[PDB]
What we know:
Number of helices: 12
Binding site for FAD: 14, 33, 43, 46, 105, 129, 312
Structural class: alpha/beta
Keywords: FAD, Flavoprotein, Monooxygenase, Oxidoreductase
Largest sheet: 7 strands, mixed
Strand content: 15-25%
Radius of gyration: 22 Å
Cofactor: FAD
Helix content: 25-40%
Bound molecules: flavin-adenine dinucleotide, ligand OZ4
GO molecular function: FAD binding; monooxygenase activity
EC number: 1.-.-.-
Shape: globular
Number of domains: 1
Order of helices and strands: EHEEHHEEEHEEEEEEHEEEHHEEHHHHH
Number of strands: 17
Amino acid sequence: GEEVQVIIVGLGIVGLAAAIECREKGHSVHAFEKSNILKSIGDCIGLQSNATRIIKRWGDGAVHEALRPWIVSSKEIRIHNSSGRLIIRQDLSEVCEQPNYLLPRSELIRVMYEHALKIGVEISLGVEVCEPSEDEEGASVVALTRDGERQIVRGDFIICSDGVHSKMRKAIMPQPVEPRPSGYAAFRALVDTETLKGDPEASWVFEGVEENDRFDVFFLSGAQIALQSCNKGKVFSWFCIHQDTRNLLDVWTSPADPNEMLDLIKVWPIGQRLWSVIRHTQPQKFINYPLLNHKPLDHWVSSHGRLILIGDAAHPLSPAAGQGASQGIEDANVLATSLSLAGRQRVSLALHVAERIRYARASAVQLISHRVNEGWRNQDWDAYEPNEQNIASLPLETWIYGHDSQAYTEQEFEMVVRAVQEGEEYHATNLPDKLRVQLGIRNV
Length: 444
Ligand SMILES: Cc1cc2nc3c(=O)[nH]c(=O)nc-3n(C[C@H](O)[C@H](O)[C@H](O)COP(=O)(O)OP(=O)(O)OC[C@H]3O[C@@H](n4cnc5c(N)ncnc54)[C@H](O)[C@@H]3O)c2cc1C
Ligand SMILES: C[C@H]1CCN2C[C@]34Cc5c([nH]c6c7c(ccc56)OC(C)(C)C=C7)C(C)(C)[C@@H]3C[C@]12C(=O)N4
């Protein structure tokens, strides 16, 4: 009477959620990660209510208590024009009915990493996983260490949560499709809180932040800028979507030129005010990340049903929209629930059930987000003032953030099993009926 043996490749946000979900539900987990995931890198990650619904269950509420300093307290989004005038206050009252988090990525990683070690996930860092294989009875990978040693590692199935540049994707989709550039990029960073404090010209940014997180949006010709705070003003973060036709690589490590941001904003009346804050970004923390459009894959599960791509390995989203991490956490929760309902003798059924629950929903978020940064609702600001028309409603969509993916999986498991095994199409109701046919989403 043994436990299911789960191999996880990659401990970004989704791999760590997968590890915690699987272990909490009684399965044995060996996770593999090639780098030191604890180094501070990136800026802030947003988690909406569909993700925090899931996180709240971890450790009878332990991870939620650890994340409590990061609960979003913004009551509205304040939308401004290039003079800095406040045009519209968009109410966040229903979006914030249930908890949302905003926090540096590395602090999220740390909290999940420590919880995973506490509940008995086995973690191997400094391990590049490659050469996965599978049959009707099990799966294995090669664990390659930095000294060149190879170790074969066997388990019941492999979770590929190895990010947008996934090398495991080959094992499922042989020929790779290249994402299409949108012609837009995003400047983004954390601000150095210590030098931001002590600059009088930037003092305005702290007003109110101890009771209501800042969430200011600024629409300039050629730049859409958002400035947010969190944890009572201990962290400030900003981003700026601008036009960029350069051949930029989509990684989080390359140095950008801060003067490119400055030149873009200083020519409008509100530029000096915004720069008084943004100037306190550390020089080697300026990221300029291209917003690429990834087409949904044809499927996520391998031929023998023992490998599944889940997070950005399955459905990369640009940081522009705000559902990337949240959707990946739903992947881990639906998969772990599916594996629990199906049992150890029905692993391939478990993976195929989870893919059919998640595919159309995740593809719809992915396809809508294309129209957000490759197109968008950006008008001539010489003639129009910004308003809610110009705020990508994706994080404000109740059918995304109100969803309870574990409840759905439990209520629908047997109907999905029936479709898998009878070879019928499963029409999931965890997205709007009109949406699937409108976006051209074909069922797996
Ligand atoms: C360093 C870094 C910084 C980021 N910063 C931000 C940010 O500031 N804001 C934001 O919105 N998003 C950021 N992201 C992206 C964000 O993590 C994802 O968009 C999403 O939230 C979760 O995706 P994921 O967990 O599927 O993949 P990722 O977060 O990309 O995690 C993938 C992980 O897999 C590991 N890996 C890859 N190949 C292998 C292999 N063969 N063997 C073992 N391990 C492997 C990588 O080292 C990485 O740790 C960052 C990602 C990275 C990697
Ligand atoms: C391009 C930029 C210009 C301005 N931005 C606003 C946005 C809406 C939004 C975001 N995050 C949100 C959150 C939210 C409600 C709405 C949003 O609730 C909380 C709980 C506060 C957490 C995150 C962004 C990802 C930053 C997108 C992207 C963007 C936009 O159009 N719409």
